[PDB]
């Protein structure tokens, strides 16, 4: 008898056919475009889109005025318009199934630091986030997989304690600015 919780789940599904060249080709293209580190970072986004599509694929076989459909479809489409991968007009449940896997990779903080002009390449954006430079409305974020919903997409700035922000430049320059 302990005061604990053992509740955990895995968040990726390893593919069945391991060496199919088309699967290796498309996921390596996603790794090289979006600045992911390994294929588990692709499979995790495939798992969250698969869970979303399984929820919509479960709701779509109901009569359209059953109240579970009318409540949970509105909640699921509201979360997808809130994170920004489904646009504001087309909130219908048939438009969940037209989500491509590149929607959730565009809303990561690494891709939204590269697309908002705060880095010179996407790999510079991930190494800028991981070195505690990027903050989102006065919370310093060290997670490159932070999915920026669009009431936080507006506030993306450099840190107040960073050399490319406010001041106090790092140990390389201040050892370098001691010459004598």
């Amino acid at each position: 008898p302990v005061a604990r919780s053992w509740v955990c789940r895995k968040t990726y599904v390893t593919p069945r056919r391991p060496f199919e060249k088309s699967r290796l080709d498309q996921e390596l293209k996603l790794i090289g475009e979006y600045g992911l580190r390994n294929k588990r970072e692709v499979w995790r986004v495939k798992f969250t889109l698969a869970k979303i599509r399984k929820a919509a694929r479960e709701l779509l076989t109901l009569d359209e005025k059953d109240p579970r459909r009318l409540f949970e479809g509105n909640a699921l489409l509201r979360r997808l318009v809130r994170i920004g991968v489904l646009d504001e007009g087309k909130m219908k449940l048939d438009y969940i199934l037209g989500l491509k896997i590149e929607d959730f990779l565009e809303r990561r903080l690494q891709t939204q630091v590269f697309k908002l002009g705060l880095a010179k390449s996407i790999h510079h954006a991930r190494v800028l986030i991981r070195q505690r430079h990027i903050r989102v409305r006065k919370q310093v974020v060290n997670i490159p997989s932070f999915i920026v919903r669009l009431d936080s997409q507006k506030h993306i700035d450099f840190s107040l304690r960073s050399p490319y922000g406010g001041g106090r430049p790092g140990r390389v320059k201040r050892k370098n600015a001691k010459k004598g």
Partner: protein
Amino acid sequence: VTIRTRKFMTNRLLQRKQMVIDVLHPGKATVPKTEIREKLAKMYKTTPDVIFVFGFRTHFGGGKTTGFGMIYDSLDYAKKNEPKHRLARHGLYEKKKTSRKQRKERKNRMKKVRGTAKANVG
């Protein structure tokens, strides 16, 4: 540097005021609790060793620190109601160290005798 006090409950049963401290210290380390007690005692028109704070967690990123603090009516209500580890953080109290295993061996050895001998069997 800056104290903000979240939700405030004045508690007439245990004779105190209950609040949650916000501490903004954006260029500094986690501030000591003595400085928080001096700032809040300057805020609430009371003396600084009738007020007791605990549990300060600095948030991630260098930002605010948020914990609890309670302001008593007098020091005698503090000596009745406050926990003895929290008074012993102030030097008002000290515990006698044996602490648990020599007491247990003295408890299982004082069962072997009877009479006045329990005092003179240690």
